[PDB]
Write an enzyme that holds these catalytic residues in place. Structure first.
Site, PDB file in Angstrom:
ATOM      1  CE  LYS A  14      -1.408  13.620 -13.584  1.00  0.00           C
ATOM      2  NZ  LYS A  14      -2.011  13.591 -12.223  1.00  0.00           N
ATOM      3  CG  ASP A  48       1.912  24.043  -6.693  1.00  0.00           C
ATOM      4  OD1 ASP A  48       1.087  24.935  -6.395  1.00  0.00           O
ATOM      5  OD2 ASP A  48       2.048  23.598  -7.851  1.00  0.00           O
ATOM      6  CE  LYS A 100       5.781  29.764  -7.377  1.00  0.00           C
ATOM      7  NZ  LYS A 100       4.726  30.453  -8.176  1.00  0.00           N
ATOM      8  N   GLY A 101       7.267  25.203 -11.433  1.00  0.00           N
ATOM      9  CA  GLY A 101       7.211  23.824 -10.982  1.00  0.00           C
ATOM     10  C   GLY A 101       8.451  23.015 -11.314  1.00  0.00           C
ATOM     11  CB  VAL A 120       2.299  13.150  -7.888  1.00  0.00           C
ATOM     12  CG1 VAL A 120       1.853  11.722  -8.149  1.00  0.00           C
ATOM     13  CG2 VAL A 120       2.645  13.857  -9.192  1.00  0.00           C
ATOM     14  CD  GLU A 135       6.105  22.037 -18.440  1.00  0.00           C
ATOM     15  OE1 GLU A 135       6.701  22.773 -19.257  1.00  0.00           O
ATOM     16  OE2 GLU A 135       5.307  22.478 -17.584  1.00  0.00           O
ATOM     17  CG  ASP A 136       6.427  20.761 -13.744  1.00  0.00           C
ATOM     18  OD1 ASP A 136       6.136  21.027 -14.929  1.00  0.00           O
ATOM     19  OD2 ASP A 136       5.826  21.266 -12.772  1.00  0.00           O
ATOM     20  CG  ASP A 145      -2.019  15.964 -16.938  1.00  0.00           C
ATOM     21  OD1 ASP A 145      -3.008  15.806 -16.188  1.00  0.00           O
ATOM     22  OD2 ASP A 145      -1.410  17.046 -17.057  1.00  0.00           O
TER      23      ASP A 145
END
Ligand SMILES: Nc1nc2c(ncn2[C@@H]2O[C@H](COP(=O)(O)O)[C@@H](O)[C@H]2O)c(=O)[nH]1
Ligand SMILES: Nc1nc2c(ncn2[C@@H]2O[C@H](COP(=O)(O)O)[C@@H](O)[C@H]2O)c(=O)[nH]1
Ligand SMILES: Nc1nc2c(ncn2[C@@H]2O[C@H](COP(=O)(O)O)[C@@H](O)[C@H]2O)c(=O)[nH]1
Ligand SMILES: Nc1nc2c(ncn2[C@@H]2O[C@H](COP(=O)(O)O)[C@@H](O)[C@H]2O)c(=O)[nH]1
Ligand SMILES: [Mg+2]
Ligand SMILES: [Mg+2]
Ligand SMILES: [Mg+2]
Ligand SMILES: [Mg+2]
Ligand SMILES: [Mg+2]
Ligand SMILES: [Mg+2]
Ligand SMILES: [Mg+2]
Ligand SMILES: [Mg+2]
EC number: 2.4.2.8
Lengths: 166, 166, 162, 161
Positions: free
Chosen positions: B120, B148, B40-41, B142, B88-89, B92
């Site tokens: 990233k 979160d 849920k990011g 971050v 997507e949030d 990396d």
């Protein structure tokens, strides 16, 4: 396709700005829990959480009809015990689903359980569930936009408008 | 004082998303564009992104836990012949993204691309093509704007680095 | 509503005890993956008919339109990277709910994949290894199989009549 | 490493209890709905249903933990106005069963009782059990649907360690 604009984007954003502080003042050592059912209120809950001046957390649920009682396709990922819960809805009317949800959640022993909705309709009288926060009181007419859909469309609208029967 | 430094202000994010929507909107012009987000990011990001895209878009969510990876909530509709944009949030390692991309392509959509907010440096290792990137950032953990740490700091409007004390 | 019976308990359980023999020869522990719930009744008797140590992995499945798309409701509790996997099905028509699974399971990269049905039909896209019974394109109910929900608890398999 | 209940004892009991329930559920066009939780009792259900003469009805549910539990797989049908028999593998300390009761009666079934195979001694918890197969002692046991780190389910008998 959109007959008329019931509520503009700025009007909606100004109302949520007010709701945020009102909610914040009441809940002002754990975070307030916003629990939303996918997916008519994702835009609303994303804006509401940012509007709330106290730390808030997200939890999502996915239900389905049996065809007053719903099938759980996706449950909460966290235990609710001793947590302040705030159910976040988009539209409440003849919503037995909300009634079921409030009972299903209060069984999990929250510390508190309130309900906040962006839109309330005249038929919400026939529902047995108290609502502590209401964004707007709108007529019974079918509206789309800001999370609200008709066959999964018009959700991405930033205003709430009325459909012409087509 | 949980946040040491601020990485991206609310203005920077809003202005960037407005650019993405325009870019995405120009590239997608002939059904509706389909936005798929994993809970849920990237919920805050996808709600702001859809409103920024000047063409009709629909939401689709997928809840998933790890063990390659486990599905807790599959899609609510078949994506056959649909133009799909994976949202997507942060990328990396991108191992979950790599699986998701493959899992969706096997459903045979008409088009499949990926849009992430942050990227990233370690994302160069993963073999996943990303058509749209909001920001490239250093390899620091971050938080904020959906992101979160133990389910906290998601409701922040900005993005910042987390202090070592937390 | 069974018009007549062509397969009974003694005939079925004996073959299921014969299927386990072949599996015991051809095959740390074996994983039986079954799709709920028309083949649950068959797996349970199959595992006990197999000498080598086996195991159960269940998977709930719904569907979208039709033609072979599949929605997942539960899916496996564990990963199956490099492991003994045997798909256990109940019926096989011209329906491709079977390899969607095999493709879905192949992508998870197990050591060995093999399918297994109790009753096959005149329609065949995957490596169907151990076939139990070859039935015509008729109605089939009983022993896990159903018609709107019922006829599952039957120890035999009868034929409905429209 | 031990033998508690032989496959003969288990199979003979199930038949005798299938007789107990077969004549106690005999007016409604609906069948007796066998509702159970994966993955332990899944071997009992197949043998219990065939031991019961009246037409019965399979129904499954998947449950994770955090008696607070989480639903991974729900019921396919609503059990309103339905005769439901909850079948559990072993009943001990966990309020998992009591939760399943308080969760299923909210669906308002016509009747709701539970039939368990084994029965731990401290299972005096909530909601009393209608039918018992074997009153087992307080010792961790596997075999016949029961497991330890995912195994020994294939066993047709019940034995300790
Ligand atoms: N788009 C939209 N959805 C609504 C409105 N009021 C209620 N809903 C939601 O949309 C559903 C409509 O489907 P039905 O009521 O036929 O099941 C309702 O059950 C409720 O979840 C509305 O005014 N607009
Ligand atoms: N909040 C936050 N999440 C991250 C960051 N980098 C990766 N993640 C997410 O964290 C998960 C992997 O971390 P792990 O759980 O393996 O420690 C993935 O879901 C990944 O997308 C980050 O910098 N901040
Ligand atoms: N019970 C039963 N199921 C069958 C038979 N043949 C195929 N099936 C499976 O059951 C499905 C029918 O279920 P429905 O789609 O009507 O819910 C078929 O698409 C196939 O997967 C049969 O003869 N009996
Ligand atoms: N094999 C076996 N499993 C048991 C027995 N009693 C309980 N269990 C299972 O083992 C689990 C152990 O986790 P717990 O819930 O006790 O932390 C229980 O939840 C239950 O599913 C038993 O006597 N034998
Ligand atoms: Mg709603
Ligand atoms: Mg709707
Ligand atoms: Mg993510
Ligand atoms: Mg996280
Ligand atoms: Mg099947
Ligand atoms: Mg069927
Ligand atoms: Mg149990
Ligand atoms: Mg166990």
């Amino acid at each position: 396709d959109i007959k008329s604009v019931l509520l503009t984007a700025e009007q909606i954003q100004a109302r949520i700005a007010e709701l945020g502080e009102q909610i914040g003042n009441d809940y002002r050592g754990q975070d307030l829990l916003l629990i939303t059912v996918l997916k008519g209120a994702v835009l609303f809950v994303t804006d509401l959480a940012r509007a709330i001046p106290v730390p808030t957390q997200f939890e999502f649920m996915a239900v389905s009809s049996y065809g007053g009682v719903v099938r759980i396709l996706k449950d909460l990922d966290r235990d609710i015990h001793g947590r302040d819960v705030l159910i976040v809805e988009d539209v409440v009317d003849s919503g037995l689903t909300l009634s079921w949800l409030s009972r299903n959640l209060t069984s999990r022993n929250p510390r508190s359980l309130r309900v906040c909705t962006l839109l309330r309709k005249p038929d919400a009288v026939h529902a047995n569930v108290e609502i502590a926060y209401v964004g707007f009181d709108i007529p019974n007419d079918f509206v789309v936009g800001y999370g609200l859909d008709y066959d999964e469309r018009y959700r991405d609208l930033s205003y709430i408008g009325t459909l012409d029967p087509r």
